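Troubleshooting entry. The earlier prediction with O,O-diethyl hydrogen thiophosphate gave an output that would not parse, so I re-checked the input for stray whitespace and re-submitted. Clean input:
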Amino acid sequence: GDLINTVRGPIPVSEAGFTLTHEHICGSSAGFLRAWPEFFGSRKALAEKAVRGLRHARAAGVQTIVDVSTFDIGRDVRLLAEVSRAADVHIVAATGLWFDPPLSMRMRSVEELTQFFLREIQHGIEDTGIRAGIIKVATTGKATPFQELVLKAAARASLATGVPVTTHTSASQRDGEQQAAIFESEGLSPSRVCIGHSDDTDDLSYLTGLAARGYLVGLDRMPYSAIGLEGNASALALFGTRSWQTRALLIKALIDRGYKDRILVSHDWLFGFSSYVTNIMDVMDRINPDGMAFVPLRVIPFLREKGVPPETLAGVTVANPARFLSPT
Ligand SMILES: CCOP(O)(=S)OCC
Ligand SMILES: [Co+2]
Ligand SMILES: [Fe+2]
């Protein structure tokens, strides 16, 4: 019945299966992979790395990932389609804007941004015909004036298409509350919205407050920890000093408080990464060699061993993403 758009075209919602709802093939910038593919070794090396990673995830039971790279994360939909085909894993692509918009975006009005997001959802990204299945937005603290427009434009595009909205927050600053206020001012249903990087905080007052309102809570940085790397300032700043087990306990905490239907789980992983320090990808691959298999291989058994029922784990990893992604 319900369909969702992937980089290989439409798929039935029921085929999405075990779905990681916040991932990247490559975290980069608009135009960068085209202008400087050698940064990644080569485009071919990048694609091969991504195919090996997604095949590993697939072997662990992952059937679909949502690549939340926007235009300004340097999303390359042809790359996503190539690797999706080679690895046989569905990929849902994104529209929206993250927190590195260039001037040609920052100068735009809410109307103009709505038109852009609609173009990528309804017509296709660039000249490819590949349609976005989610809208990615971001704040890092209080929203900038431009970020206010972006969140309103995302709400309007979601209302028009039924495609969900997913967010980057600075979770320690509780950005989700302001994001929610902006979304609701536009009349967007909280069930269409995932407040992301919510596992970057242990503030369950903040998290249950959102979940109580109907928001999905993105616990989407599972493998991130610089424990043991504290001498590496850049890894420390990006990864944090909380263990993956600490992050994973949040999933249990929300399930134990009645919020099992409001949780989405992912890694925020990537196979190339040019928007941060050089060789950050080598540090990450050492910390988490399992890549996007880490959730099914480590997180889901950890939870099962803590007594979370399999039905509940299936509801979190299959039913929740399905309900979220289904245009509504
Ligand atoms: C660690 C990854 O965080 P981000 O997806 S906000 O960076 C862009 C790839
Ligand atoms: Co983010
Ligand atoms: Fe991300």
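This one parsed fine. The first helix runs from residue 32 to 35.
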